[PDB]
Structure formats: C-alpha cells, structure tokens
Design a protein around this ligand. Structure first.
Ligand SMILES: C[S@@+](CC[C@H](N)C(=O)[O-])C[C@H]1O[C@@H](n2cnc3c(N)ncnc32)[C@H](O)[C@@H]1O
Ligand SMILES: Cc1ccc(C(=O)c2cc(O)c(O)c([N+](=O)[O-])c2)cc1
Ligand SMILES: [Cl-]
Ligand SMILES: [Cl-]
Ligand SMILES: [Cl-]
Ligand SMILES: [Mg+2]
Length: 213
C-alpha cells in the first residue's frame, strides 16, 4: 500500500465523480491533513489557473505527472478539443494518474506518455502528431528542466510565444534552468512568487516565453 494509492483511494471515497474541482480539493485536503506529497498544490495551482486562462493553449505538454493533480488542474480549464500530454517515467505513478483522470472524467482530454521525458520528447511529433507546443509545464526532476528545454528546442517543438511554466524554481530550486532562461534572449521571463505546496516555505513559478530562434 503506497502513499499514492492512499491519495487515489481517498479521492474515490471523498470526491464527486466527474467533478475535477472536487478531486483537486480532495487531494489537497488529504495532503494537507494526512501526508504531504509533491503536488503543485492550491496556492501555486491558482497561479497556474490564471496563466492557463490567459493563454488558452490548444496543446499542453506536462513533464512529471505524479498522481495527476496538476494534469486535472490544467485539463479542467482547457477549451473543447484542446489536449494535454503528460510524461511520467514511474509506472506506478502513471497508473495512479490515469485512474485520477478517469475519476475526474478528464480522460478524453489527457494522454499519458509512460517513460522518461528525454526518450519521449523526440517521439512526440511522429507518435502523437504534434507540430509545436503552446505551453509546457515543467515539474519533473529539477536537474532535467534545462536539458529538456534544450531538447524541446532541438526537436523543433517550441514556437515563438510557446509558454514554459516551471514549478519549484526556488525550492527545491532549478538554478541552471533559471539562470539560463533569464539570461537568454530566446526567452522573456516573469516570476510569480508563491509557497511550496501545503507549506509556508516560499517557492515560485517562472514563466519563460520562447521568443523564437
Ligand atoms: C513533482 S512530481 C509531478 C507533480 C505533478 N506535476 C503535480 O503537480 O501534481 C515529479 C514527477 O516527475 C516524474 N519524473 C522525474 N523525472 C522524469 C522524467 N525525466 N521524465 C518523466 N517523468 C519524470 C517523477 O516520477 C514524479 O512523478
Ligand atoms: C526529499 C524531498 C525534498 C523536497 C521535496 C520537494 O519539496 C518537492 C516539491 C515539488 O513540487 C517537486 O516537484 C519535487 N520534485 O519533483 O522532486 C520535490 C520532495 C522530496
Ligand atoms: Cl541526459
Ligand atoms: Cl497549497
Ligand atoms: Cl512551513
Ligand atoms: Mg513541483
């Protein structure tokens, strides 16, 4: 019995089937009251919500799904026909995420790619019929944010205006990625100060908009 299985069971026992808001609030309640877990959480998630609503992306890539909290959070705000692709290398967690999306009734909007971002990113265009991404949510191991950004650019997946939105740029921190995009004329960056999920430790999201080659 894993913490992720516990989160899922608590959602099935407490949330309303087909109600993404209810599912979010259930996961937040469990992780606030019973066991901390690395979901983006409600404070940063409200910022995510506002960004999603501003850009109305048709195609979103998420890096790191975990239990599907952020996937539910973003998918519930997508326009009809818009898509989220989420990459998750832990098969146990990917299983839990799929069940979480099913419960929320979001399964038709979200596609889970099992495996490591660095292996899956080069297969996106061919295997998933992707041209360029409108938005990317980076929230996997922090040492991959920079390498996967370079890899996205190499594979032609970024267009002028693609929005990168990065979690945890303060804590645990992503120093190479943050130095890189803030220093590069290829990105326009904005910092949104907030708090680490379920705590009062300061963290923040960085928005880095690709400006083209
Ligand atoms: C912080 S959790 C994702 C949380 C999720 N975005 C949310 O807010 O609910 C990080 C996840 O990244 C996954 N992960 C780490 N490195 C990865 C990689 N290179 N490719 C795919 N998934 C990876 C881990 O297995 C874990 O599920
Ligand atoms: C041992 C330990 C230390 C710090 C954290 C932690 O704070 C954390 C928070 C996140 O939002 C997050 O995305 C990740 N991550 O992907 O590794 C870790 C989680 C576990
Ligand atoms: Cl590598
Ligand atoms: Cl929170
Ligand atoms: Cl705290
Ligand atoms: Mg995170």
């Amino acid at each position: 019995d894993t913490k992720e299985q516990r989160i899922l069971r608590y959602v099935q026992q407490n949330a309303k089937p087909g109600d993404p808001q209810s599912v979010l609030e259930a996961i937040d309640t469990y992780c606030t009251q019973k066991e901390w877990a690395m979901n983006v959480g409600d404070a940063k998630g409200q910022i995510m919500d506002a960004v999603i609503r501003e850009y109305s992306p048709s195609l979103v890539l998420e890096l790191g799904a975990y239990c599907g909290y952020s996937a539910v959070r973003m998918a519930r705000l997508l326009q009809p026909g818009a898509r989220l692709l989420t990459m998750e290398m832990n098969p146990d967690y990917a299983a839990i995420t799929q069940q979480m999306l099913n419960f929320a009734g979001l399964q038709d909007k979200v596609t889970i790619l099992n495996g490591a971002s660095q292996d899956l990113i080069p297969q996106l265009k061919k295997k998933y019929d992707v041209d360029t991404l409108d938005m990317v949510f980076l929230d996997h191991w922090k040492d991959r944010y920079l390498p996967d950004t370079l890899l996205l650019e190499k594979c032609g997946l970024l267009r002028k205006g693609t929005v990168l939105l990065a979690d945890n740029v303060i804590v645990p921190g992503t120093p190479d990625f943050l130095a890189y995009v803030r220093g590069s004329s290829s990105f326009e960056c904005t910092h949104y100060s907030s708090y680490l999920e379920y705590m009062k430790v300061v963290d923040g999201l960085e928005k880095a908009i690709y400006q083209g080659p």
